[PDB]
Amino acid sequence: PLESQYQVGPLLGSGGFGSVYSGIRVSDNLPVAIKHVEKDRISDWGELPNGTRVPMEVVLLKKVSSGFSGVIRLLDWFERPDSFVLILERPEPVQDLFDFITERGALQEELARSFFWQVLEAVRHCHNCGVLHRDIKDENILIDLNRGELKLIDFGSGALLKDTVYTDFDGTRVYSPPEWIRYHRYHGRSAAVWSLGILLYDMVCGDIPFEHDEEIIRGQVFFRQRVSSECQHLIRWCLALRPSDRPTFEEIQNHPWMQDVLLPQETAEIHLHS
Numbered sequence: 230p231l232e233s234q235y236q237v238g239p240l241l242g243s244g245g246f247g248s249v250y251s252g253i254r255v256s257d258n259l260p261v262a263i264k265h266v267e268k269d270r271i272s273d274w275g276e277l278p279n280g281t282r283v284p285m286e287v288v289l290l291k292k293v294s295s296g297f298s299g300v301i302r303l304l305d306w307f308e309r310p311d312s313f314v315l316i317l318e319r320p321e322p323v324q325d326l327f328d329f330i331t332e333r334g335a336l337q338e339e340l341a342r343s344f345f346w347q348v349l350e351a352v353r354h355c356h357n358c359g360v361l362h363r364d365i366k367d368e369n370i371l372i373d374l375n376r377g378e379l380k381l382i383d384f385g386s387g388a389l390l391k392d393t394v395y396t397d398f399d400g401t402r403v404y405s406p407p408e409w410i411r412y413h414r415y416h417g418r419s420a421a422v423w424s425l426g427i428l429l430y431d432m433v434c435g436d437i438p439f440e441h442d443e444e445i446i447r448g449q450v451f452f453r454q455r456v457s458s459e460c461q462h463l464i465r466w467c468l469a470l471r472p473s474d475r476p477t478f479e480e481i482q483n484h485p486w487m488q489d490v491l492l493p494q495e496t497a498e499i500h501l502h503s
């Protein structure tokens with residue numbers, strides 16, 4: 230019934246993907262996020278295992294649903310005449326990573342390492358469940374501030390993971406790889422790695438490396454902030470122009486810059502004041 234189940238709070242954020250509100254489950258006072266998505270704006274429609282038409286985003290969220298805290302959990306969903314309403318997990322207190330970096334600037338490498346590791350674990354969880362996120366970026370990462378735990382959100386641009394070529398894309402252009410800009414052709418995992426390179430640069434420098442198509446295509450990385458040689462190496466590897474020159478996930482997590490990660494709780498205690 231929705232109205233009798235949730236008390237709607239203030240708008241957390243909005244866009245083409247939808248409008249996300251703070252909410253509370255009236256049942257047990259659980260903090261939730263209530264995301265509204267217009268039907269007219271859904272491009273990718275999905276198949277439920279029982280044969281009901283839902284947005285692909287619902288398909289993908291159910292597929293990644295788990296006790297694993299690295300990916301946002303879908304709690305319920307509703308269909309309305311003109312929209313879908315998604316009830317999502319909400320950590321409290323929380324801060325979106327984009328806002329975190331906007332406030333604090335370039336992150337210390339120990340913190341970036343902890344954050345980047347957790348994103349890698351979350352993205353590996355998605356792929357292992359057959360889900361390609363397609364919009365990995367700071368804005369789509371929430372920080373559980375008490376626990377030091379990160380959560381991937383916004384599966385509205387995602388697709389089922391396949392090993393064949395993707396010829397469609399509606400994620401964030403400044404995180405999209407050169408093969409998409411030039412050819413309108415990418416493969417899931419190597420494009421994901423590219424976006425991860427953009428993200429890591431963003432963490433350690435406080436902003437993204439490329440603004441224009443010409444820059445993405447050239448792939449020349451300039452460091453505006455002091456960044457260790459190992460981190461620079463990892464970033465430049467992720468941002469290899471040829472998709473096949475990019476590291477696998479295993480290679481990223483075995484990289485020397487990635488050793489001795491802090492646990493999330495240690496991360497909270499040292500860097501999040503907790």
Ligand SMILES: N[C@H]1CC[C@H](Nc2cncc(-c3cccc(/C=C/C(=O)O)c3)n2)CC1
Nearest residue numbers: 241242243262317318319325368369382383
């Ligand atoms: N692309 C979106 C735009 C709204 C942004 N705003 C915020 C800010 N603070 C918290 C949240 C939030 C809290 C709980 C769940 C979610 C999930 C959103 C989603 O899956 O789309 C999002 N969302 C998040 C990224």
